[PDB]
């Protein structure tokens, strides 16, 4: 009830570290071995997780509760607007902690506030397990149909959410029935294609005097080029612009 901005929904997070099993099948080789060195890696990873994650959630005042900690177990529960943008900085902090060697598979889902947490944890562990095999670095967003790699997430969606948020808040008479109609024609192009792309071109033409003579061109070329990363972008814009 503190987050009176977006949709009143509760998000949970499941995660683990990529390629960790092969990292312990063959830890350090013969020719450059002393005994003591490989323990420092694992203690650095463990102390990174516990101390660094506790400090990171402390310093930016996140509405996130934490259950596990580890490279195989990580479960946090909180507001979706606070754990969705914690995932990218989690990716960045574990990326530059590992010096871009070991990466993250993560799974984030969105839940009703009154919901059994055992059901949440099972469903989001399976959601991450959909993103886990995709191993490769990837995060899935609330469903097995939306699985994105980390750079795809960060770059593609968080500029195609930043552009949507930057443009549609400048306009007092487009948000958000036009965004709902654009979503409805965009999510249905998967089965029939030239019909929805033609209606999309026509309706981007007819809003080109309101949403912008530039903006409709990026909406058209983004819908042609990378439209799965825009339907999720408009979806999370809708979810964070609720009420």
Partner 1 sequence: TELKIGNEKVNSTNFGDFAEKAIRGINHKPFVNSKGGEQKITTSKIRGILELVNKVYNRVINTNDVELSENILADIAYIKVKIAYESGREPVVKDFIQRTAFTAAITDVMNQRTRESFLLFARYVESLIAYFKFYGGKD
Partner 2 sequence: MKLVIEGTIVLKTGMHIGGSSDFSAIGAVASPVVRDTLTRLPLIPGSSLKGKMRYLLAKELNNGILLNEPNNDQDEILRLFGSSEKDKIRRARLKFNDIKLSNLAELETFNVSSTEVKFENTINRKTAVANPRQIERVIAGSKFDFEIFYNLDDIKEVEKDFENIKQGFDLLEFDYLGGHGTRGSGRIAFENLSVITAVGNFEKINTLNEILGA
Residues 58-97 that bind partner 2 (CB under 8 A): none
Alpha helix (H) ranges present in 48-193? Answer: 53-59, 80-97, 117-133, 150-151, 158-160, 162-168, 177-187
Among partner 2, partner 1, none, residue 55 binds (CB under 5-8 Å by kind): none
- Closest contact distance (angstroms) between CB of 15 and partner 2 is 18
For partner 1, which is the closer residue by CB, 13 or 204?
204
Give the Cβ contact number of residue 205 at 10 Å.
Answer: 11
> 229 and 160 in contact (C-beta within 8 Å)?
yes
Tell me whether residue 72 is annotated as binding.
yes
Residues 121-140 that bind partner 2 (CB under 8 A): 123
Residues 188-227 that bind partner 1 (CB under 8 A): 192-195, 197-199, 201-202, 204-206, 208-209
Of 153, 137, 7, 8, the C-alpha closest to 85 is 153
- Closest contact distance (angstroms) between CB of 189 and partner 1 is 11
Tell me whether residue 132 is annotated as binding.
yes
Strands 138-141 and 75-79, how do they pair?
A: unpaired
Tell me whether residue 85 is annotated as binding.
no
Chain length of the chain: 243
d(CA 175, CA 68): 40
Instruction: Give the one residue of 199, 220, 222, 226 binding partner 2; rule: CB under 8 A.
Output: 199
For partner 1, which is the closer residue by CB, 92 or 193?
193
Of 45, 44, 85, the C-alpha closest to 61 is 85
d(CA 188, CA 170): 28
DSSP helix/strand/coil, 137: coil
For partner 2 (CB under 8 A), the number of binding residues is 17
Strand order across the beta sheet in which 64-66 lies: 64-66, 75-79, 10-17, 104-111, 138-141, 147-149
Q: Does 185 help bind partner 2 (rule: CB under 8 A)? A: yes
Q: Does 243 help bind partner 1 (rule: CB under 8 A)? A: no
| Residue span 5-44 as binding mask against partner 2, x where in contact by CB under 8 A, dash where not | ----------------------------------------
Q: After which residues is the chain broken (C to N over 2.5 A)?
A: 134
From 63-71, 87-95, 216-224, 232-240, span contacting partner 2 (CB under 8 A): 232-240
Tell me whether residue 93 is annotated as binding.
no
Tell me whether residue 82 is annotated as binding.
no
Give the helix/strand (H/E) hosting 42. helix 37-47
Q: Does 239 help bind partner 2 (rule: CB under 8 A)? A: yes
Detail the residues annotated as belonging to a binding site.
Answer: 16-17, 19-21, 42, 68, 72-73, 132, 136
Q: Where do contacts with partner 1 occur on this chain (CB under 8 A)?
A: 192-195, 197-199, 201-202, 204-206, 208-209
């Amino acid at each position: 009830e503190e987050v009176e901005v977006g949709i009143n929904r509760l998000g949970v997070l499941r995660a683990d570290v990529d390629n960790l099993g092969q990292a312990f099948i063959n830890g350090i080789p013969d020719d450059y071995l002393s005994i003591s060195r490989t323990a420092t890696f694992s203690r650095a990873m463990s102390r990174f997780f516990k101390n660094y994650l506790n400090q990171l959630l402390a310093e930016k005042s996140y509405k996130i509760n934490v259950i596990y900690a580890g490279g195989d177990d990580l479960f946090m529960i909180g507001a979706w607007q606070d754990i969705l943008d914690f995932s990218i900085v989690l990716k960045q902090k574990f990326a530059d902690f590992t010096q871009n060697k070991l990466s993250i598979s993560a799974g984030i889902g969105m839940f009703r506030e009154k919901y059994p947490v055992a059901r949440m944890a099972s469903l989001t562990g399976d959601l991450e397990d959909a993103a886990k095999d995709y191993t490769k670095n990837a995060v899935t967003l609330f469903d097995a149909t939306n699985v994105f790699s980390w750079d795809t997430l960060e770059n593609d969606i968080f500029v195609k959410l930043d552009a949507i948020t930057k443009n549609f808040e400048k306009l007092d008479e487009t948000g958000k029935a036009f965004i709902y109609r654009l979503i409805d024609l965009l999510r249905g192009v998967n089965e029939n294609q030239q019909i929805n792309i033609a209606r999309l071109a026509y309706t981007l033409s007819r809003m080109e005097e309101k949403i912008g003579k530039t903006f409709a061109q990026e909406l058209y070329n983004w819908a042609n080029a990378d439209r799965k990363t825009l339907i999720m972008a408009l979806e999370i814009y809708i979810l964070k612009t609720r009420e």
